């Protein structure tokens, strides 16, 4: 019942979309050609 | 208690979202081969 709340799947969601941002940024800047 | 809130993490999710929506149809879009 805790896991599948609102509050802590938006909690969640906006973690790994800071994370996936962060890496994303990090594999753009690193572009070789 | 106001950056744990509901609607700001919604809003931040949404603006990270468009942002790395944005970054990655310029990286798709340009390729070296």
């Given at each position: 019942r805790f896991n599948s709340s609102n509050d802590?799947?938006?909690?969640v969601t906006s973690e790994r979309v800071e994370n996936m941002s962060m890496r994303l940024e990090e594999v753009n800047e690193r572009e070789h050609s």
């Open positions: 802590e799947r938006i909690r």
